[model samples]
Target: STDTTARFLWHAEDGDVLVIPDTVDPDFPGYVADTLGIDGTSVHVERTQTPLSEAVLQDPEFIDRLAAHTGTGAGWSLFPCVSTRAAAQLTRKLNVAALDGYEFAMQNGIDLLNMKSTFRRLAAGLGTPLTDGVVARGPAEVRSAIQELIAETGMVIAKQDRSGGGHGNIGISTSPESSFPGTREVLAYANDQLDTLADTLWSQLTDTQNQFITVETYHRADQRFFFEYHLDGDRARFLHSSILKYEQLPESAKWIGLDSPSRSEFEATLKPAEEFIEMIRTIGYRGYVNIDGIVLDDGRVFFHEINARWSGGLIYHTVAERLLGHDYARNNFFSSILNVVPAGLADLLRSLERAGVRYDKDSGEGAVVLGCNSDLGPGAELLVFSKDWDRLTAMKDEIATTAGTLS
Candidate 1:
C-alpha cells in the first residue's frame, strides 16, 4: 500500500513535497526522484507511526506550512485520490476544499450505489443491459438464489455487496466441470460443497448492518472492458477506456492487466455510459467513475458493476499520457503488468539500461517502471509503450531477462 503513495509522485511537480511511509525502501524513492529530476527535499519521509494522510491532517503547523509551500498563501486544496470516510472528514474539517467527488458521494447516498445490489437495481431501472442476479441475505436467500442461478445458467457468481476486484466473489456451479473466471473460489453442487459454501460465505459477508449479497449468472464474454468518465459540475465526459485481461487460475481467472485495440466498437455503448454518469451527477457526484461491463459473443454488451472512485490503472495511464500522448493506447498496443516478480527498483533500472530497452520519454517506446518495493506481493508495477502488443511483450521479456543478469 505504501507503493501506492509513491504513485502520486508520477503527477508530482518539481516543488511538490510528498509524505510517504517509512516502510518503503529508501532507494525506491531515491531512484524515482532522481529519474524524475525531483529535488531530495521534495519527499518528506514520515518518521511518525501515524498513517500518511492522518499524520498530515492532525498536524496543524505542518498543514499550514504545507499549504503555504504549495501555494503562495492559502490557496491550496487536498487531492486524496484514494478516498475513505476519514479522508472526507479531514477535507471537511479543513473546509479548505472538497474531497473531489467523495464529499458529494457521501452526501447524496451516491456512495451507496457502489454496492452490487444498488447497482443491479438502478442499472436495471435505467434499462442498461445487465447480467441476471438476485439480492441475497440470510440463509434461505443465499442458498436458494445461488442454487437457482446455477441450475439456470450452470454457473453463478455470488459477490458480497460493497466489494470489488476479485476478492468478494465466489463461483457456484451445477457441475464439477463448471468454472467462472473472476471468482476467488468455486463451489459445485455435484461436489456437495454448496452447504459448506453457504455457511462460510454467510459468516464472512455479515457484520454490523451489512447483510446484502448478489448471486448472478456469470456470462462468458468475447471481450470485457471498463469505460471511465470524468464528471465535473454540470458536465460528464469520457476520460478513457481499457480492455481487461485475465489469467486463468485453477478455479478462477485472476485479473492481470488492461489491453485495448480501439474504441470504435464501443461507440454504441458510449451514450449509456454517459447516461450513468449523468444519473449519478444528479446526486452531486464528481471526479472519476469506472464501469465494468462485458461484450457477449452475440455482440450485445451488459454492465456488471461501477466504482465512483479512481481506478488502480489511473496512475500508469496518467504517466503514459503525460509522456507519450492521450491517445497512446489507441496509437500503440498498450498493456500493463501489476503482479510482477518482486524486483528492486535500482536493479530494474540497471537491467533496463543494460538491455538498452529503458523507456524513451521522447519516443515513449519502452518500459516505464512505475513503482517498486521488495517487500510487497507485487514487487513492482510497470508499463511498456510499444509499437505493438508483440513488441510490448518483448520489451517486458527482455527487461526480465536483463534483470536476471543484473549489471
Candidate 2:
C-alpha cells in the first residue's frame, strides 16, 4: 500500500486528475506537479478510504468519480493491479476510452509475457539466449530439476514463477563458498539433504501463491543489465539511458541499487532479444517491455527474464529524461538507490555536499537525492551521476558507507 501510494504520481500527466487512496499524501501531487508549474487544480485529487485497487475494483461510487476524468484519449494504462477481466470490466462499465488496449494487450501480450512459463516457452521458439533450466511444479518436480542443474553447474536457483522480485528466489550449492547473487538465500547443501530441502523450499515458494518455479543454473555476474523498450505497432524503441547494477565483490545481484551508463556497452549483442520483441510486436501487444539478462563470468550473455509492465527504470528514466533531457542517457551516466534511510530529505542533500558526495550540477557529477511518500514523511532516494562506468562505481562507493547512518 505504501508503494502503491508512492507510485501513482508517476503515471499522472500535468492536467490529469488522480483518484488516489486516502493514504497518498495530499500534498505530494503538488510537490511534484506544482514544482513544475502544473495548475494542480484544473485537475485535483480525490481519495478512497480503502486500498486503491479494491476501490477501483469494487466501489461503484469511486468508479463514478473516476469516470468524470476518464474519457476518450484521456489515457489509462494498466498496472500489475488490474487484470484482463478487471480492465475489460472498467472499459465496459465505465468511461475509459482512454484505456490503451485493455483487453488485447493483457489477454495476449502482457499476461503471457508476465508469466515465467510462457516466457520459457516463447524464448525457445524465438531462440532467445536464456539460462538453461527446467520449469517445475511441486516439490518432487523442483528437486529433480535442482539435482540435474546442480550436477551440471554445481549451483541451482529455484525462483518461483509469476511474481516476486527476490522473495520467491533461493539458491542451493554443493560448495560452501558458492553464492548466486540475485536469490533470497544461498544454502550450502549436502546430497543427503536434497529431499528435505526440496520440500522446505517448495513449501515457502508455494506460500507466495506461485504455481511453478523456474530452475536455472547459476552463473557469476557482476552486473545484471537490462533494456526496456516501448512496443508500439511495429517499432520497439529502446528506453534505456540504461548501467541497469554493482561491484567488484560480484555478490551484488540483490536489489540494493542500480545505475545507467551513457549508453549500453552490449548493444550489438541484443539482436536476438530484439528479434523476440519484433515477434511480440507482430502481435497486438503494445506496452513497455523490459528484458534483462546476465552476462556470465565467461562473457556469455543469457536473457533471463521479461517484465512487460511498469518498472522503477521506467519511472526513473522518464524522470531523468524530463529533468535532464532525453539525451541524458547518451550524455550522462547515473546510479540510483531507492527508499534508503527514510526522513530529512534536505538533510541528505547538504549532508552529501559536506561529505563531498552531493551532485554538483555545474560539474555534472556527484549524488542528487529525492524523497518519496514523504508524508510518512521523507525517505531518501539517491541518484548519482558520474562521468563513466568506473567513475560512477567509485562515486557510488563514496556515499555507500553513509547510506544507513542518517538521523
Best by lDDT: 1
Clashing pairs in 2: 243-260, 243-261, 343-378, 374-377, 374-378
lDDT of 2 at 225: 78
TM-score of each: 0.85, 0.82
Each model's backbone clash number: 1, 5
Candidate 1: tens digits of C-alpha lDDT, residues 192-305: 565677787787766675688888888777777778777778688777777777866454677766764534345667777778768877766667778888777778777888
Candidate 2 lDDT tens digits, 1-407: 34235444545565566555644444455545543345665555666666656346646786677666664424643344333445556665664553455657435446666777778788987788877888887888877888778776688888877674555778887776665666777777667787888888788767555677788888766557777778766588977735445321332235555667523456544787788877877765667777777665667777777777765567667656655677887667777765456544455555676557666546667765444333221345666776676787776665656655232
Which stretches in model 2 have alpha-carbon errors above 4 Å? 1-4, 7-12, 18-31, 34-50, 71-84, 105-109, 207-209, 244-253, 262-264, 346-370, 373-379, 386-407
Report how far off residue 312 is in candidate 2 (Å). Answer: 2.0
True-structure RMSD for candidate 2: 4.1
Off by over 4 Å in 1: 1-4, 17-22, 27-73, 82-85, 100-110, 175-179, 190-196, 260-265, 374-377, 404-407
Q: Candidate 2 at residue 119, lDDT?
A: 81
